[PDB]
Amino acid sequence: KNEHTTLLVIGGGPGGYVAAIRAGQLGIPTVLVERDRLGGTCLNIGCIPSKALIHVADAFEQACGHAGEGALGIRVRAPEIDIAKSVAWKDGIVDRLTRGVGALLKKSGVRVLHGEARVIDGKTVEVVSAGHAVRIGCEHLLLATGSEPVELPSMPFGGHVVSSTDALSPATLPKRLVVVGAGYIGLELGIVYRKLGVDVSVVEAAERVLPAYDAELVRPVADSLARLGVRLWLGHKVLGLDKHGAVRVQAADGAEQTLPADRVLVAVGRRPRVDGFGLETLMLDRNGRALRIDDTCRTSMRNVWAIGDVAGEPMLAHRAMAQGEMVAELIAGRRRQFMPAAIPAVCFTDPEIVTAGWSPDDAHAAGVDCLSASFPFAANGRAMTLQATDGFVRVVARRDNHLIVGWQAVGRGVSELAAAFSQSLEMGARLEDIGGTIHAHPTLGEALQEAALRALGHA
């Protein structure tokens, strides 16, 4: 059974399915191959499940009266959680979203193939299923195979040691949990478990949590971990398990300690999926363990494109989707299609961190003289009505023309400011534009206007 198409997309994740949909809507014959389930990591074992379990944990924290309910005059009595049912609810959401994706692919004229794909050459792929074996030819090959968790060499995945995947579908809650990695995945999940009554410890090699973000921005997250009772082991590397199932931890000076645990989450990073499916035959230029690409997602081989996590950092769903749309547009012969100067991100810890564009340090590294100003939520009315006064909002702008080049915010319930950050950046707003924009009262968003004005005050 020999087949042919114009665009062959390997991987049914955000990058892949969004790319295929747009392609189909543009009239490009397209075939999408997916070994597991449509939606990839993002829907099945990443974004949605984590955000779903974060909602359960926040809801359980509040029910327990651990989110300051007493101060409001609400005297509570201990609730109970059936984690299996929490996970089943989360799975229901994932079910509804996958079908929606599947139906959207159908409506766009894309033919989905359920199978494991092996690349034979730049314009030929073998798709293997339960007994099937078809060979598909193509004009364009779009690689969007994503990524997988990085396994610690001294402590592999199995038994008590798990990845984010199993952490998102627990059958039971453990008494003690040790998390390796104070990145956004390890902390988001670490906090989920802590709010659910689990004794949680985090092990990070860097001098502080969330090393990818600057110091000022992370401080309110550190404080929160302190109040929540999460034990932090900063400047410590994991050497492996001992006989009693405890995690051996080594400090900078050399002296070691062991943290007991009946469950260990390793969240040290993510590795691009480039091995095991004949990608060797193409011999594509590499950028670390990821496929090298130019700013239009083209690889070193003509008509072989790469998007999403398989094309490196930043490993975000919206970035993969935006990249996929750009590729579909190019194949359809459309010009003027560029990736934006700034990609927003939200880290769903408590408090949350939201960023778009440059931080003050990123602005100095790029050789641009910039001023910045922040406004604390401690002086924002809305924040006080929500009992969420920690954190702040920061604006970053060029000193010469006041063009905004970055936004950062840390606080509870600040995630939805992300849209204001990326849209203002996409429009090229200046401090004066924001300073002059009337913001609804009372809102957390008012802090954006105040930050801009404060930057114009000590300008």
Ligand X SMILES: Cc1cc2nc3c(=O)[nH]c(=O)nc-3n(C[C@H](O)[C@H](O)[C@H](O)COP(=O)(O)OP(=O)(O)OC[C@H]3O[C@@H](n4cnc5c(N)ncnc54)[C@H](O)[C@@H]3O)c2cc1C
Q: Catalytic amino acids? A: 441
**Smallest distance from the beta carbon of 453 to Cl ion, in angstroms?**
7
* Partner in contact with 388, chosen from ligand X, ligand FMN, Cl ion, none, beta carbon below 5 to 8 Å by kind: none
User: Is 15 flagged in the annotation as binding?
Assistant: yes
**Smallest distance from the beta carbon of 130 to its own copies, in angstroms?**
30
Contact, 189 vs 170, CB < 8 A? no
Q: Rule CB under 6 A: choose which of 42, 142, 191, 246 binds ligand X.
A: 42
> What residues between 174 and 233 interact with ligand NAD by CB under 6 A?
231, 233
Contact, 405 vs 430, CB < 8 A? no
Type of residue found at 197: G
Residue listed under structure tokens 């747009």: 22
Kindly list the residues in this chain that would bind ligand FMN in the complex (CB under 6 A).
Answer: 150, 152-154, 268
20 binds ligand X (CB under 6 A): no
What SS3 state is found at 5? coil
Paired with 2 in beta bridges are 135
Contact, 394 vs 372, CB < 8 A? yes
203 binds its own copies (CB under 8 A): no
Q: Rule CB under 6 A: choose which of 12, 186, 324, 357 binds ligand ADP.
A: 186
- First-to-last alpha carbon distance for the chain, in angstroms, is 69
User: Among the candidate windows 77-85, 119-127, 249-257, 292-300, which touches ligand NAD by CB under 6 A?
Assistant: 249-257
> What residues between 6 and 25 interact with its own copies by CB under 8 A?
14, 25
Helix axis angle, 184-195 to 47-63, nearest 10°: 30
Q: Rule CB under 6 A: choose which of 38, 138, 182, 316 binds ligand ADP.
A: 182
**Smallest distance from the beta carbon of 35 to its own copies, in angstroms?**
22
* Partner in contact with 76, chosen from ligand NAD, Cl ion, ligand FMN, none, beta carbon below 5 to 8 Å by kind: none
428 Rama sector, left if φ>0, alpha if ψ -120 to 50, beta otherwise: left
**Smallest distance from the beta carbon of 325 to its own copies, in angstroms?**
9
- Report d(CA 186, CA 23) in Å as an integer: 35
* Partner in contact with 436, chosen from Cl ion, ligand ADP, ligand NAD, none, beta carbon below 5 to 8 Å by kind: Cl ion
- Report which secondary-structure segment, H or E, holds 161: strand 161-162
Concatenated DSSP letters of 377-388: GGG-HHHHHTT-
List the beta strands (DSSP E) in 123-167: 124-128, 133-137, 140-143, 147-149, 161-162
**Smallest distance from the beta carbon of 448 to its own copies, in angstroms?**
6
User: Is 329 flagged in the annotation as binding?
Assistant: no
The two tokens of residue 408 are: 């950062």
Q: Where on the chain is the footprint of ligand NAD (CB under 6 A)?
A: 231, 233, 251, 255, 257
What residues are designated binding site for ADP? 204, 238
